[PDB]
Amino acid sequence: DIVMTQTPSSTSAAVGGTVTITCQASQSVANNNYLKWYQQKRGQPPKQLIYSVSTLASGVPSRFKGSGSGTQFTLTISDLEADDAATYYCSGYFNNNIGAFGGGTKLEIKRTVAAPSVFIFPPSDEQLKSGTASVVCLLNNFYPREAKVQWKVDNALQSGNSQESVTEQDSKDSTYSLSSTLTLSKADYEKHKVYACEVTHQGLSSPVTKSFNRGE
Amino acid sequence: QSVEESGGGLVTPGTPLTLTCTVSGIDLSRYAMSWVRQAPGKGLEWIGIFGSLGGIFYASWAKGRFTISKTSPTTVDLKITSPTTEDTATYFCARMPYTTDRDFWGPGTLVTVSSASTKGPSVFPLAPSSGTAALGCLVKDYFPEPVTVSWNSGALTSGVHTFPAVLQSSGLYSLSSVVTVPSSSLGTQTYICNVNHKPSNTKVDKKVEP
């Protein structure tokens, strides 16, 4: 069928830099100019950037530029800002009355290293009443995204009973946030005393530990 | 100039499902409407379009699986004939011109195709214990997605981080929403998280306190 190959799948660049996204269609777009560039962020619909291959959409900064032939198209983003962290899509229409999208390109904005602020939350009494115990560890506003979060109960390394969830990259400070939840039953929870979340990150000289004693 | 989808939610595999797209300030006698979808964490996918002159066009893979129609001068339908598991996705209705900037998308509606039953969440407080303090809300064991979480009925917005949901080994979803505030503010103001899970018609307001 009709294919739009968008490269790169993902890329990174610093504020003020430049990124170049390429879209390659298997055949020429309709009227040689049915081609639009979109920017999409988590939980939102896409927001237009370029139409007619090269025309700047109203209200879009001029640092977004579109170019191309009839089958290969280029989106160039200059003078990168924090707000540009998103996933970008090419959208095309074809003479057989068919629309298509490129696979998308995820752009991460680079910034200076930011160490996380760590918090530990013991389970609530309301949850313990229900027979389950979830211990939550919060890494707040850090960069880069890579982090090692390990659980230690009575100083025994846990494995396979925790789960991590990560935010999108923040559009203001280009940081990420992460939650690591240790999931136990109330029984297994009451088997132990010391609960510790250990965080290793490029921003920390040595691993930070946040802990509590059950029932203190 | 706005667009809104409706009719999303949980549907059983094989049960027909019709979504409705309602526009306001958009002239459907002169402009076309498109149906697009996006599975969680994946790219946009073109489903079809109802054209300005009544032409109806579908992706090659979508013919038979979908029926697009205009039901009124301001509404366009997308009927999924026999939903399957792979049809789970956020569905967008969009005024998406390729050669103009009069581009308007609806917020999207999540369609989950599954035989499991809907379950409202349990909301538990992540309280701050002994400069900066953190608190939150554990939104545990619900199905299907999604839930919405606000803080102080929308008045609290700075430093809020609502993490994406994780599918549990039980087949239910769990999510957390946290916020950071100055430690001085803990005794001074109330902190309430407003969770809404529409598929189960659950609405919970939870006070989180030390």
């Binding site: 309709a30 009227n31 049915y34 229409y93 003479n95 009355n97 629309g99 | 402009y31 076309a32 379009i49 054209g51 300005s52 002159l53 009544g54 032409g55 011109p97 390729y98 050669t99 103009t100």
Partner: peptide, 6 residues
């Protein structure tokens, strides 16, 4: 070429 799409 005329289209029902813009």
């Amino acid at each position: 070429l005329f289209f029902e799409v813009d």
